[PDB]
Ligand binder design. Structure first.
Ligand SMILES: Nc1nc2c(ncn2[C@H]2C[C@H](O)[C@@H](COP(=O)(O)OP(=O)(O)C(F)(F)P(=O)(O)O)O2)c(=O)[nH]1
Ligand SMILES: [Cl-]
Ligand SMILES: [Cl-]
Ligand SMILES: [Cl-]
Ligand SMILES: [Cl-]
Ligand SMILES: [Mg+2]
Ligand code: NA
Ligand code: NA
Ligand code: NA
Length: 326
DNA sequence: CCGACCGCGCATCAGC
DNA sequence: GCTGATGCGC
DNA sequence: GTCGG
């Protein structure tokens, strides 16, 4: 929060480009700037000072001067005054409603929460759940609750099969004192890059968690990726906990490190690392790290036995989870 | 300049 | 039914 | 919107 004013501005600008302009590269350009500045250990005094940092160009330097000088940005002031922009930005806050759907709904006259509610018929399954838990999904999850949730998930998983290994990643693994959701990496010895000796591996876990009333809804579900809703159990007479978003990813056992790396994030950290990888002649995905042949085509997976091996391949000093929050 | 911007699972759709 | 592109999200 | 070659 040392430069909280500036970073909030950039993020607001990032959201505008993504949601309203549908300019994904401008979106990421603003995010990178916000990130590098959030990490800057000095209270910024000028755009020029800011331009020294990588990711901050001329355009953003100018905006920072305006912000430092007036405490606001006219460009944003107008965006906030624009009804269409405001409506699209809001609608995209519903899980399942993206830039396209948001703009389309506004085109039909659906611009508010009230509107969405009386038009459920026009929403797909995911969007319907996103609306239902609109309020809840906006709430943060205290680490204390993340710990209780972890306990439930690991123990329930263990009940299904002692050989499953469930790892909580995302901001939680990065040591965050609060998280936006719960991210679970799952592995079973019967599922490897070599073969799938047992079907319904993810299903079983999902089913067990639904049985105990932990998982309450499903946004989407496939063979290796579950995306849904969960809720901690409340005691007698106490208000129940808010519903939380939960993602579960089943990854081949032998590809755990690339998997835990990917799911630990952050998303921006992953983008930076994968980009750096390319520059170093490698391509990284949640399964493997492969070299780039002279042609520019990925080669065979390289041997990995720790998160650090991945960092070594691209000549990056290892960075603990707590330091990957970009 | 100007091309590149990480990589991929699931839901949905049009076209065959 | 299938494949492929697109939307959305992680 | 920003970067490198
Ligand atoms: N290669 C990519 N990896 C991505 C991307 N988005 C998410 N991820 C990865 C890294 C997250 O930690 C992880 C979980 O995705 P999530 O959105 O939950 O992020 P995080 O948990 O880090 C969080 F934003 F901090 P939260 O508010 O939930 O506490 O998924 C992406 O665009 N590319
Ligand atoms: Cl763009
Ligand atoms: Cl402003
Ligand atoms: Cl691996
Ligand atoms: Cl791969
Ligand atoms: Mg998360
Ligand atoms: Na710069
Ligand atoms: Na959304
Ligand atoms: Na998540």
């Amino acid at each position: 929060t040392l430069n909280g004013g500036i970073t909030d501005m950039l993020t607001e600008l990032a959201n505008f480009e993504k949601n309203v302009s549908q300019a994904i590269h401008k979106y990421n350009a603003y995010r990178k700037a916000a990130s590098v500045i959030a990490k800057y250990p000095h209270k910024i005094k000028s755009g020029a000072e800011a331009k020294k940092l990588p990711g901050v160009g001329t355009k953003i330097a100018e905006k920072i001067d305006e912000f430092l000088a007036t405490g606001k940005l006219r460009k944003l002031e107008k965006i906030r005054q624009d009804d269409t922009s405001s409506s699209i930005n809001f609608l995209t806050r519903v899980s399942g409603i993206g830039p396209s759907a948001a703009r389309k709904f506004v085109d039909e006259g659906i611009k508010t929460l009230e509107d969405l509610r009386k038009n459920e018929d026009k929403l797909n399954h995911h969007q319907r759940i996103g609306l239902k838990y609109f309020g809840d999904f906006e709430k943060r999850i205290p680490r204390e609750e993340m710990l209780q949730m972890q306990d439930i998930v690991l123990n329930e998983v263990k009940k299904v099969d002692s050989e499953y290994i469930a790892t909580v990643c995302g901001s939680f693994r990065r040591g965050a004192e609060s998280s936006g959701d719960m991210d679970v990496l799952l592995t079973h010895p019967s599922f490897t890059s070599e073969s799938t000796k047992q079907p319904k591996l993810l299903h079983q876990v999902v089913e067990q968690l639904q049985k105990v009333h932990f998982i309450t809804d499903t946004l989407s579900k496939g063979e290796t990726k579950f995306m849904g809703v969960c809720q901690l159990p409340s005691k007698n007479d106490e208000k129940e906990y808010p519903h939380r978003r939960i993602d579960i990813r089943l990854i081949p056992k032998d590809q755990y490190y690339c998997g835990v790396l990917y799911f630990t994030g952050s998303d921006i950290f992953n983008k930076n690392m994968r980009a750096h990888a390319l520059e170093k002649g490698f391509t990284i995905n949640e399964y493997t790290i492969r070299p780039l042949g002279v042609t520019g085509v990925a080669g065979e997976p390289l041997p990995v036995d720790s998160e650090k091996d991945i960092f070594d391949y691209i000549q990056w000093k290892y960075r603990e989870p707590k330091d990957r929050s970009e």
